[PDB]
Amino acid sequence: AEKRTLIAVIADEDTTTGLLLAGIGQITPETQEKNFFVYQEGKTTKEEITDKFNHFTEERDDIAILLINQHIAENIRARVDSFTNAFPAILEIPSKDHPYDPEKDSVLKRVRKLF
């Protein structure tokens, strides 16, 4: 059933600038807040990513697919590991300026156990 068409993006200013340039999300006027989180290396707090991820994952039921980087999700892996619901779905991708690793996937760890 169609109950969401919003796409969330959790990445740096370059990936969020390119994804916002091509178009994956926007700012909805019904909530009065943006649908993306701009992250900075050594500039933003670690609690803001967990608050934006918890507010986008638990305080909103209109997001279809929410992307999150493994580097920004590494500091919030405790709060991101507690979420297992597919509404909205969480897809772990490699962050820019870092190497890809399959061990940083939260869905791959629970999906690997009891396959």
């Binding site: 370059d14 390119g18 340039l21 091509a22 649908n35 992307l67 297992t84 490699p94 820019k96 999906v111």
Partner: protein
Amino acid sequence: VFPTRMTLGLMKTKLKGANQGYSLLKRKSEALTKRFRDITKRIDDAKQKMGRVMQTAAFSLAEVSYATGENIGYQVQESVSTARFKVRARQENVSGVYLSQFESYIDPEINDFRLTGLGRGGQQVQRAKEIYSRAVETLVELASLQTAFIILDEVIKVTNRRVNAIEHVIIPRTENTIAYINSELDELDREEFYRLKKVQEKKQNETAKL
């Protein structure tokens, strides 16, 4: 206290139904395990390809933004107030369960915004969004399978638990109750015929004597 008569006929249909449901749950658990394995490989392959494809577009957008000479992400983030590429929720029955699917829809409401007006410098900002707009579709279509893979991985534990519990708890109560009910009904049925035959033999032996 328990019912002795008419219990094996009632327990036989539950034993046959559990015997068919155990094989059906085993086959559905095997197909869900194979689909969970194929989705487990395709999620890693699409995650790696979406990771490299996102890293190439992020490197090209960072090279275009660094080659421009200004913060295009600040005006691009404030100038964005609507999305162009969206998704539609739909239920897809695959392997006997409801999976989450995403269908990409292109609407002509969110076009390129007038935020590049530096003359020749707007061409790299236009080409970067022109490359990222085609680059985002492979990341969305590759990332759409995670909702179905999480649902299959969530259903595989319940199918694996029900396939073991339904096969474990089904047979022994109806088998022991049916065997005890038939074992008591056999001697309980034979005892009246033995007492009637002994009464008829005692009546014939008493009638034969004087």
